[PDB]
């Protein structure tokens, strides 16, 4: 008898719930930076609102 | 009726960015990181046209 596990996943159609598996970075404001959030990516200046 | 006129043009142009144009998704980074490079070139070519 083997405990055969058939593992599968599906990103790339929806936002995600199983995240932060690794370490994040710090905030940089008032500069043209490259931000990466949970679902949202992009590049811009992160001013204070 | 000039100013409104020109404004409508610009608005309509930006509303062509959220349009699929027969491809998979309007947001370009998704097609950049879901599919293979030939398939990505096909869907990006639909968006470019």
Swiss-Prot record, chain B:
Official protein name in the record: Spike protein S2'
Organism: Severe acute respiratory syndrome coronavirus 2 (2019-nCoV)
Highest taxon in the source lineage: Viruses
Function: Subunit of the fusion protein that is processed upon entry into the host cell. Mediates fusion of the virion and cellular membranes by functioning as a class I viral fusion protein. Contains a viral fusion peptide that is unmasked after S2 cleavage. This cleavage can occur at the cell membrane by host TMPRSS2 or during endocytosis by host CSTL. In either case, this triggers an extensive and irreversible conformational change that leads to fusion of the viral envelope with the cellular cytoplasmic membrane, releasing viral genomic RNA into the host cell cytoplasm.
Gene: S
Coiled coil: 1-44
Residue window of the full protein shown: 950 to 998 of 1273
Lineage: Viruses, Riboviria, Orthornavirae, Pisuviricota, Pisoniviricetes
């Amino acid at each position: 008898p083997y405990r055969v596990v058939v593992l599968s996943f599906e990103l790339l159609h929806a936002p995600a719930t199983v995240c932060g598996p690794k370490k994040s970075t710090n905030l940089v404001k008032n500069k043209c930076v490259n931000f990466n959030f949970n679902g949202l990516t992009g590049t811009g200046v992160l001013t204070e609102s | 009726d000039v100013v409104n006129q020109n404004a409508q043009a610009l608005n309509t142009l930006v509303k062509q960015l959220s349009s699929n144009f027969g491809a998979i998704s309007s947001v370009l980074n998704d097609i950049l990181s879901r599919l293979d490079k030939v398939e990505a070139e096909v869907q990006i070519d639909r968006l470019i046209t």
